[PDB]
Amino acid sequence: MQIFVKTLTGKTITLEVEPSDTIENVKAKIQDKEGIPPDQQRLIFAGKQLEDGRTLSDYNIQKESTLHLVLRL
């Protein structure tokens, strides 16, 4: 399944992941795609902080949905 991750500057990185993939896996893919370390990534969907233990189906992230990416220290 194809999802979009928009960064703060507006860069929209497209990801191919399964609905049963954990947010930790999504952040690891973001790392190996762009280089952002997962311990610094924060994913947000509908204003809820996505936990590294939940999955795309837990937040019901559907096809071609947008996830907002913010950075920590």
Partner: protein
């Protein structure tokens, strides 16, 4: 001769637009509605203007009617309000590249991670950290006229512009009560600048209130803030003259 329900003008079908409930509006009214939502005081969700319609304008009609800049800024503001709903008002943008980032609000070392920027700043005075070592924001501002004039101007601005604890937008009151409802959905007080929880924050004893120490609802803090701004200006001029070696106003006229 189809009549728009918003502006009441008559147009043909080609110059119209609809929502999911097939309400008919003119394209210019939808444009001004999105403008009031994005670059003005309005809700984020471009809902159908009619109250009977819980639905909204579909994204296809938006992408067909709204210009490119309005739609881009709409998406940007949606991201802004989602960040506000997520990590509240802890996102700080770099003074050199506006690159947003999150910090715990306990450390002032904002090193812009953007490789095209990577500038170490201080989130309190927007000053460079390599110069800011061993010195406070006051001292680093006093070390230069370019720093001090701008710092005084920013103090005079903050003395009036009231920031929202959610989207961080600056607000002023045109008229009315001291309860401010931001366009992101957060309520605040125009006297104490605190995120209120409703109308149980103000005083409702109209009979000088000596039964509750709560903020008034109709008091205009215009004169107080103006006097504070004028005092900031005067004291800044005095400081400049006192530490100016025989040298030669910071801010607009005070009327």
């Amino acid at each position: 001769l189809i009549e728009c329900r918003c502006c009441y003008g008559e147009f043909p079908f080609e110059e119209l637009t609809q929502c999911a409930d097939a309400h008919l509006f003119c394209k210019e009214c939808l444009i001004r509605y999105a403008q009031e939502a994005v670059f003005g005081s309005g809700k984020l969700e471009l809902s159908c203007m009619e109250g009977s319609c819980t639905c909204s304008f579909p994204t296809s009609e938006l992408e067909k009617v709204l210009p490119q800049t309005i739609l881009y800024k709409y998406y940007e503001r949606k991201a802004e309000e989602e960040v506000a709903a997520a990590y509240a008002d802890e996102l700080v943008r770099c003074p050199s590249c506006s690159f947003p980032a999150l910090l715990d609000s306990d450390v002032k070392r904002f090193s812009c991670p953007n490789p095209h920027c990577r500038k170490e700043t201080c989130r309190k005075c927007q000053g460079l950290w390599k110069e800011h070592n061993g010195l406070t924001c006051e001292e680093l501002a006093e070390k230069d006229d370019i720093k001090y004039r701008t710092s005084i101007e920013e103090k005079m601005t903050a003395a009036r512009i009231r920031k929202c604890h959610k989207c961080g937008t600056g607000l002023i009151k045109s008229e009315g009560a001291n309860r401010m409802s931001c366009r992101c959905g957060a309520q605040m007080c125009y006297l104490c600048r605190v995120s209120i929880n409703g109308y149980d924050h103000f005083c409702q004893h109209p009979r000088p209130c000596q039964e509750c120490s709560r903020c008034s609802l109709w008091t205009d803090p215009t004169e107080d803030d103006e006097k504070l701004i004028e005092e900031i200006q005067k004291e800044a001029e005095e400081e400049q003259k006192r530490k100016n070696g025989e040298n030669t106003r910071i801010g607009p006229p005070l009327e």
